[PDB]
Design a protein around this ligand. Sequence first.
Ligand SMILES: Nc1ncnc2c1ncn2[C@@H]1O[C@H](COP(=O)(O)OP(=O)(O)O)[C@@H](O)[C@H]1O
Ligand SMILES: Nc1ncnc2c1ncn2[C@@H]1O[C@H](COP(=O)(O)OP(=O)(O)O)[C@@H](O)[C@H]1O
Ligand SMILES: Nc1ncnc2c1ncn2[C@@H]1O[C@H](COP(=O)(O)OP(=O)(O)O)[C@@H](O)[C@H]1O
Ligand SMILES: Nc1ncnc2c1ncn2[C@@H]1O[C@H](COP(=O)(O)OP(=O)(O)O)[C@H](O)[C@H]1O
Ligand SMILES: Nc1ncnc2c1ncn2[C@@H]1O[C@H](COP(=O)(O)OP(=O)(O)O)[C@H](O)[C@H]1O
Ligand SMILES: Nc1ncnc2c1ncn2[C@@H]1O[C@H](COP(=O)(O)OP(=O)(O)O)[C@H](O)[C@H]1O
Lengths: 312, 308, 308, 312, 308, 312
Amino acid sequence: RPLLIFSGQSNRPLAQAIAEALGLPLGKSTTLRFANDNLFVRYEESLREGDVFIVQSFVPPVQDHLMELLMMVDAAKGASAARVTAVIPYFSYARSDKKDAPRISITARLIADLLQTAGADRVLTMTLHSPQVHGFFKIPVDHLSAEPVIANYFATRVDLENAVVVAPDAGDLKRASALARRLGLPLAFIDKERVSDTEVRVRMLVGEVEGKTALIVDDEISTAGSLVEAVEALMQAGAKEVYAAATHGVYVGPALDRIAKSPVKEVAATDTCPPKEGPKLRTLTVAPLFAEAIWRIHRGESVSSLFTLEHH
Amino acid sequence: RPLLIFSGQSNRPLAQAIAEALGLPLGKSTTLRFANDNLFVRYEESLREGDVFIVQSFVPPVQDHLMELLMMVDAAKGASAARVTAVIPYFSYARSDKKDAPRISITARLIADLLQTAGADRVLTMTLHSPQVHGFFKIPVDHLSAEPVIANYFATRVDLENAVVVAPDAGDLKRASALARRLGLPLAFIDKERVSDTEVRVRMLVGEVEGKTALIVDDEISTAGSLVEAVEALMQAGAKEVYAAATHGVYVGPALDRIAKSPVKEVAATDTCPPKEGPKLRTLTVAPLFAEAIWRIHRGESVSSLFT
Amino acid sequence: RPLLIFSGQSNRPLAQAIAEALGLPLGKSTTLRFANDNLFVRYEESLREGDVFIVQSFVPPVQDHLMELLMMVDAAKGASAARVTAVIPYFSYARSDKKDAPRISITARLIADLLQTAGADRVLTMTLHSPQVHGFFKIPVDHLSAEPVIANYFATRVDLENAVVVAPDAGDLKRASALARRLGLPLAFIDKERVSDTEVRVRMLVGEVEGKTALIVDDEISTAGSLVEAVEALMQAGAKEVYAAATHGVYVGPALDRIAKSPVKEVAATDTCPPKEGPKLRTLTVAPLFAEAIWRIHRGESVSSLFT
Amino acid sequence: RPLLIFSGQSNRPLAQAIAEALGLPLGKSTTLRFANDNLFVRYEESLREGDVFIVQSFVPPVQDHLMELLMMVDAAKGASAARVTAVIPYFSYARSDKKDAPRISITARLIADLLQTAGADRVLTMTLHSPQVHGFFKIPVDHLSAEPVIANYFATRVDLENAVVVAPDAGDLKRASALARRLGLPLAFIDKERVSDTEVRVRMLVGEVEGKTALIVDDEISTAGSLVEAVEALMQAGAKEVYAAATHGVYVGPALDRIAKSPVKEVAATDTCPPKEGPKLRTLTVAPLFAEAIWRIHRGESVSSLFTLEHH
Amino acid sequence: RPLLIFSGQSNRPLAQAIAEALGLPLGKSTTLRFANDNLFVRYEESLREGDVFIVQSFVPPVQDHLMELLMMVDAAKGASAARVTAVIPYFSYARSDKKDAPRISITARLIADLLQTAGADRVLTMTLHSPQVHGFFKIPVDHLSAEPVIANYFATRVDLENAVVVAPDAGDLKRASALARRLGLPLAFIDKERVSDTEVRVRMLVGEVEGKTALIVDDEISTAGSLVEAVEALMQAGAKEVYAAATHGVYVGPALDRIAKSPVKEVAATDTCPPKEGPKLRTLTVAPLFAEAIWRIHRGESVSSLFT
Amino acid sequence: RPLLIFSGQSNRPLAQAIAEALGLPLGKSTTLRFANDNLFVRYEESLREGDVFIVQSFVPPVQDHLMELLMMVDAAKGASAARVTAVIPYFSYARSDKKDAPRISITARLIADLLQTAGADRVLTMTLHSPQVHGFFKIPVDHLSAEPVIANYFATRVDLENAVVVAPDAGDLKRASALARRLGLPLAFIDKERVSDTEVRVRMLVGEVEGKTALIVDDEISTAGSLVEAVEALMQAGAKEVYAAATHGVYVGPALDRIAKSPVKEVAATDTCPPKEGPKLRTLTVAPLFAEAIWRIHRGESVSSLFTLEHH
Ligand SMILES: Nc1ncnc2c1ncn2[C@@H]1O[C@H](COP(=O)(O)OP(=O)(O)O)[C@@H](O)[C@H]1O
Ligand SMILES: Nc1ncnc2c1ncn2[C@@H]1O[C@H](COP(=O)(O)OP(=O)(O)O)[C@@H](O)[C@H]1O
Ligand SMILES: Nc1ncnc2c1ncn2[C@@H]1O[C@H](COP(=O)(O)OP(=O)(O)O)[C@@H](O)[C@H]1O
Ligand SMILES: Nc1ncnc2c1ncn2[C@@H]1O[C@H](COP(=O)(O)OP(=O)(O)O)[C@H](O)[C@H]1O
Ligand SMILES: Nc1ncnc2c1ncn2[C@@H]1O[C@H](COP(=O)(O)OP(=O)(O)O)[C@H](O)[C@H]1O
Ligand SMILES: Nc1ncnc2c1ncn2[C@@H]1O[C@H](COP(=O)(O)OP(=O)(O)O)[C@H](O)[C@H]1O
């Protein structure tokens, strides 16, 4: 069973870097859009009895990328692949994980079912918005952590002697605590409120940030709305400075303008989504980690062992 | 089980015309795009134990409309609809009906499976690109015919005395021969072959078109490449004039410019796709026909005594 | 389709209270254990073309109750029920909602699939451990909220003037903030982390509790380890007093001894699980609320105008 | 995973020729019919973890052959085969591919679903009546073409200097055009009408047939009704002579009598269906092509490469 | 949902007798064979939102009848039936119920799955070869008993005073003992073993048959090999006379000649299979019993207060 | 694909003996019960792309053992096992194989469906209560026979010169006849009735038992109700003595007391269920036969060949 890697249109540079890290070419496939906006996929060479891995992130245009992935998985099974894995570095619809209003779609579950119907045997992903999304799949899911790559970034960039990890929202405490333990840093919480959409009010601080290098971490940065509020709150609480990181650098709508305007020193994210150009933006490549996971899925070696427990 | 009608963003005017024909309101549902281009759907009122009909055509943006339909079907079942029908007036991906090259998707079949997985109990549709696409569905499909509205259009709009109906494709003749039979006309057909998405090559023309008014009938008009080449080939062959009709007026890319430029006298299509205004374009509404079919599906009355 | 209600052995008192609220008898069904500890279920009368509701909570013995529910669902479909709803007032395995260690079962999802395979057409439940568990089901779930009965309990039973609602867990805030909002109170939360099945470590306390009457609201109380540690941590932080409420009063192992010993003034829970008598324990019945939801599911009326 | 080949009762000679071309014995299986007309299948030896290929064509008695195939696929999965392929050289029910009347079965789709339920992992077939029938299967389908074998036959039999390929029906133009391009021949069309079921009227001819060796090709010959009409029309249009070929030589009811009575010089068909004895009947064996396809399915080599683009 | 009854080609007389007992017409459907022995089915009128019952027994030609049933079920669902019941008065392949040799089909289970895939929502059947075959179906099965019509036949047709009921097979005793109990008679049984499709070897005879009138009751009579060997073995053992009854009078190959030749006095069977005339053969119609069961399934009334 | 064997809590000694007979360690897995009586399973090491076999018998507590098995099968698929086999040495619910009352569960079929839903690819079992239970599974089932091990036991224990096999119930004749043919013994039948639950009446005897060593065999001994009645009937018919054997020594409720009180010389059963201590109880280990079957399933060798036709 040859190992074969293909890409949709979402993140061909990540797919290419993954193939190169495996010492393999990126498989040849074409995606066309007809004048009627219908899609067409075709594998240019045989992938018969292949262990096929198809890379696609849920970035704009999202529904074209979802359909391209469904059609490439379908076409791979139809062309007699032995096994088909959906490599989905950023699964945006993991945010659609609950029925928080009546009569909506739990779209993360619907998409799991659609991927299974299309013929996916497995999923490989990173930093799901919520860990319960794993249970929306019947097929095996290998869920990679960005914890080691994000902690490495900070360890190489900031003054650890004078640093603190800050959660700006109750939901951020678990991921922030993991980072704090990895860097040997104190953990603080900043309870803030957007009052007049130009001012944010510091209600409560637990821990110390005054004159400290504050670190914030999230699963994703979309519009940078939460990043901006936390940084403003932290400078109002007298932080020296703020470094931010996330797994998914989605960077849509006002994100780039907001980051340029914010006093935030730097914003780092992986390449699960194609990076955008910006003076304070940094990229943390996960091509080598996805390549190692794919190698281990293919050979039946331990993907769980890739979650290291190193302390800086 | 109350009759409930809802619309996606593809063709709200047709859905509204269907609701009005049934004497019902169009049900309230929200579709929005988050900043990250992710879709969100919500039914504003209960549809619990409803006989739910969701109207969506496959028109640009097609993948957004496909996903909005899948999400509306899913959310209707999740909101305890008694039955959910995907009313798909135009199913574009019916053209993806065969494996004409290795290692492609038969995307019509894939989408049938996605619609079933999303929770569709049935489909209502009109003029599938090929009749075999009916077999891509496990759930029941009511497959409506445009033949009555197209027959009526030619019967009253064109001189019939020296007319021939032309099938623009040799593989798909049943439609042209049934229309030819219905208007008491002879039949010609074009043997083409597609060169690109936008260009076709006429390899042969069978039948008598010399000095005749030629009536092209097709399933759809997309780029209008097949239409204007068939008109070029009929005029070159000595046709007096050409008229055309299709169910699906998709009219993308160079279509409206190509039709306006072509010597074709008039082009009729239904409103399965939102009509685009043009001097030589005519709309044949199928709202009443979709309404009558929905009423009949709802009540358990014969749909065949209309359709196909 | 007649409305039919049945009970497993887990919570016959709640099922009986639901039946009485609907003005119906509790349907007759036998469950027995053979000498070899194999289960046997039998419906004593026809439920053919019935709208069948089977009440079972996940309380000890939990695997016997799970299997009795699966077997009652299966036998109801095999006896030609028109529709079968698994009414699961307490779904314990909602706590098994994530893969927080390698090579485990996401048991909430497994059980959703087993319930579907057994033949369940729907689920009715209350206060799932996490809202994402709704997405583990393909069949529709009506997910009832305890917020009205818990709000009413605190509003009338405790002094509100100097009160704060405390979320005993930082990841699950929507419940505490909606209760805080509803009572016009401020909000504190505990950032914990579980050390064992019976012990939790409070890593941080956010909000103002000094000299306040603290209202703990949680989904469930199992061993009461999280409850008494949160009370220890609030009193240590200078709270005047603590009251607590949860939907699911599971009260296993050292719970009743731990609550009686704790300075907590009172602990309210619903009857999703059969109440256990204790001087500081109060029962908030949800029988009327399950009855109203079943009537509405049966008739196709809005459940959301109660729930969630 | 050993390669194992078995046969139902429909076309044991083709199954035997396929096995022999692979250098393999035909696997031992018995099919009994009890006095009550119920069927019984049994594999005489282990096929555990085998790559098992079961040959059955849809020839009379068709429903016994369909049920035998379903039961052999079922029994193979039940006996712990690794993989089961339905080798269906002639899939008669591909003609039942549309709802052309209300309240009928689209029997080609129903049979696809029944084969999948029985436990088929894959299908290997040749010349489906319509190409849309491929999309009635969820399991992979390898669809072989008879184009190269039929074009070879004509290239070895007829005067190519004076030959023309004729389509006698609009539906026949695509297959006829492919043959014409392969043999470097002109393509003609003959519009004819059966008027008084003893006479057929030539309405229109496009291209030339007068004094030419006319070639006609179809997917199948059942009753030879369409073959007879085309040949009569072509001799009325002054053709020298007519050679006919098809993939599936089904040859039911009056076919043999009609062919003997027709001026048609010769009628060639493959052995997807067991050939019938007749003076003007010729057989074009596809045992070697099915054997090559099976070899390539088994080894994960390119079945698509078997579709050659050779011109005579 | 209107009650609609249809027949395959296997047993149109029984279907007609069922329709007449319900006061309904037998619905119109065409089955034809194409020249190439491919089947074709068509419903002549709408059965949309129908409660559809399709009658087919597994009698020669059995594979044609199986396929005609699968195709009628499929086409009924494709024509938007509300519910489709496969009424299978005789399910021959219930005899293929075990893996008694390696690498065979358990064909009863395969056919249950094919019937489900074709779209059957339920089965109505009578006297399955083994009761376990009920477990081969996921969809509900109403399994009718012949015991009332067989009991009544022996009670009025034979002298009971010196009678014994004989089970012709030691593994299948529940039928003979329930009939023995119902007629107030003692019970004997034959321990056989099948040598071929047409021959059985009696290895042991248990019970008192000397000078008695022996009543053989079996599920079916196929070749009559087991019947005439059991009669040979009872007369050899000193029985005065033998009578026999079975549900399914299949009567293939040498059966009618073997019965006529055997000293057996009379052989009764139902019309699950079209009766074959013979001097010693009697028909016990089960049309009224199938009609009553269909009416009850249709209306949601108790079938068990008849069946099994 | 490594061969990997794990155990639930039901019969760890049998699982351990099977692993040892394969020359393999018993895989490490933990099962916890939380205070709320909920179960938790975890595989301590990778079983990725493993051929995994999970041993569990349906012994008390039965529903905890059923759920543990479902959860271990689920978790194995979730941890990316290549193949998962449910090794179920005693399938108690095979007794729940018919609808003998209205509105009950055919629980053997329900459990088959639950095992398939959990992700079982295959079942390996021994002495099903009824052979029709095989057809309740869609997944392959290897059904082992205890016939050779039970016949060996008697051949090593009893005076074959003066022995007879007795069926005490019509349903017992087939299994008793097989034993009789294997030991070259006559077969007798004893028709008895429990009249006053302290007395049993011999209605009929066919064959001879007077002064003979009577052998009785069953699929299982639960409460020993049927064993006791047969032995009492046989001593009333003047048997010298009675030896009993079964596959499944379930031994619940009064079984041990009843066997001690009965004149039965000895009662032998396999270790499909953990043996209970008793003076007249003997164990016939099937660990070596299950190990051989697992070896052959894993390697694709003939499991059917393990059914020997030896005569003593
Ligand atoms: N959904 C689609 N939209 C537009 N073009 C398509 C679509 N699916 C396939 N096609 C293109 O159209 C070609 C088929 O054109 P044609 O020869 O008319 O066959 P068909 O009978 O399916 O229309 C395909 O080979 C492909 O290039
Ligand atoms: N069904 C269950 N019953 C009790 N404890 C469980 C159950 N499932 C998992 N657990 C345990 O509880 C832990 C989760 O506790 P917690 O941190 O509160 O997460 P959650 O949000 O799921 O409660 C798991 O890691 C496991 O040790
Ligand atoms: N559908 C069937 N029709 C006729 N005979 C069958 C059928 N299926 C299996 N058999 C044959 O009958 C034998 C079973 O006969 P028997 O010992 O009576 O067992 P059963 O209890 O299934 O009748 C099988 O071994 C096979 O030879
Ligand atoms: N796929 C999605 N992309 C973007 N926003 C989404 C998506 N799904 C839901 N949302 C919106 O984002 C919010 C979700 O936040 P909530 O579930 O309360 O906490 P969290 O931010 O942790 O997910 C709004 O409730 C919801 O409408
Ligand atoms: N499996 C079959 N075998 C034989 N004839 C069939 C079969 N299925 C359908 N037919 C008949 O053959 C005809 C099909 O022709 P039609 O679909 O119009 O064009 P084509 O001949 O290209 O299939 C009749 O419509 C149909 O009744
Ligand atoms: N899983 C089970 N464990 C124990 N007893 C059971 C089980 N399932 C059914 N029973 C009981 O055991 C009896 C079954 O006997 P029956 O089916 O008549 O013959 P057999 O004893 O051969 O199975 C009672 O009918 C039934 O209630």
